[PDB]
């Protein structure tokens, strides 16, 4: 077939360049499609990736573009190890969209419009090591949403609209080194939420409207004091006091609860 496998004309052009082919109209064989190892398209006019299920051996997909809105065909790409979908209009993820990507190591989902995550969306991704969900519109996380990501080392949740964290949400991320929660609307965190992060080197907690009422603020306050070398500011420098009370502006770790 003459590359009418790919209905989106921007994606077809992308396939054209990938395979170095002559034109949109040029013909392609499945043997050519199988040789496609990585697809990159930055700042594209792609809207649908509808042809992509016929490239069964791609391992690196980077699609960024303001108009991308349909990614259901990605579910079939069994062998992805790097997946980047950024700057698009996606407000949700299709259910089970990642369920076959058991080799995915990195998942880059920043600068989109995601308001929620499907329950169990990441459960099959046991090899995932890096997860970037910053700059979206998330207000909540499903319970246990990271529980299978036991090899996770970096998790970026910054620049969202998070109202709360689920209890136990980070309990299984014992290899996590980097956790970014800055720039959200968190007034509190569940007690003990960080205590199993035995590998944590960097945590970003600033630009949240922390409620420093006692005794609720006690856990966060004692944790920051105990782990003050880990708390990083906007400029990536070490600053324990960057977590501030929404009313007083005091540093969270300066609140002492009788």
């Amino acid at each position: 077939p003459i590359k009418q496998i790919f209905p989106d004309d921007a994606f077809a052009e992308t396939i054209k360049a990938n395979l170095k082919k002559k034109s949109v109209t040029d013909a392609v064989t499945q043997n050519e499609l199988n040789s496609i190892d990585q697809i990159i398209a930055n700042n594209s006019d792609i809207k649908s990736v509808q042809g992509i299920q016929y490239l069964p051996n791609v391992r690196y997909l980077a699609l960024g573009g303001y108009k991308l809105h349909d990614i259901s065909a990605l579910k079939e790409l069994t062998n992805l190890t790097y997946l980047e979908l950024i700057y698009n209009q996606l407000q949700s993820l299709p259910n089970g969209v990642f369920d076959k990507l058991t080799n995915l190591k990195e998942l880059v989902l920043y600068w989109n419009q995601l308001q929620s995550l499907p329950d169990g969306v990441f459960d099959k991704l046991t090899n995932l090591t890096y997860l970037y969900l910053q700059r979206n519109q998330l207000q909540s996380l499903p319970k246990g949403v990271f529980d299978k990501l036991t090899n996770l080392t970096e998790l970026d949740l910054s620049y969202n609209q998070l109202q709360s964290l689920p209890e136990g949400v980070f309990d299984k991320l014992t290899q996590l080194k980097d956790l970014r929660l800055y720039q959200n609307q968190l007034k509190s965190v569940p007690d003990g939420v960080f205590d199993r992060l035995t590998s944590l080197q960097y945590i970003w907690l600033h630009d949240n409207p922390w409620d420093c009422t006692c005794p609720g603020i006690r856990y966060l306050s004692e944790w920051i004091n105990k782990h003050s070398g880990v708390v990083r500011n906007s400029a990536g420098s070490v600053a324990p006091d960057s977590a501030k009370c929404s009313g007083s502006g005091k540093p969270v770790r300066s609140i002492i609860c009788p």
């Binding site: 980077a62 080194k177 990083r232 990536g236």
Partner: protein, 104 residues
């Protein structure tokens, strides 16, 4: 320092950017001698800043008086290969983890 794919001693800043942008990969990077005297610079390509076309950031490697090297403070290394290996595994406050060595 050589033998490492991510090192290009003569590469200028302009050469770095064209090749980084031609690569287009998030976390593409090139380690090159700085314009300065006795300084190293790490050029990283990343798309996490608000521009989907991607931007190039040039990170000059810092030096303590004690002759250790750092890009991210508190993470002092005695050797540029040691510095780079860490930043290949940890975003460590940079625009991106060093994900992909770009060369030629």
């Amino acid at each position: 320092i050589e033998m490492y794919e991510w090192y290009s001693k003569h590469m200028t800043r302009s050469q770095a950017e064209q090749l980084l942008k031609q690569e287009g990969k998030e976390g593409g990077f090139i380690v090159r001698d700085s314009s300065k005297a006795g300084k190293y610079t790490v050029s990283v390509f990343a798309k996490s800043t608000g521009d989907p076309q991607g931007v190039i950031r040039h990170y000059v490697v810092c030096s303590t008086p004690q002759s250790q090297y750092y890009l991210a403070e508190k993470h002092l290394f005695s050797t540029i290969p040691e510095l780079i290996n860490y930043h290949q595994h940890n975003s460590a406050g940079l625009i991106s983890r060093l994900k992909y060595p770009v060369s030629q």
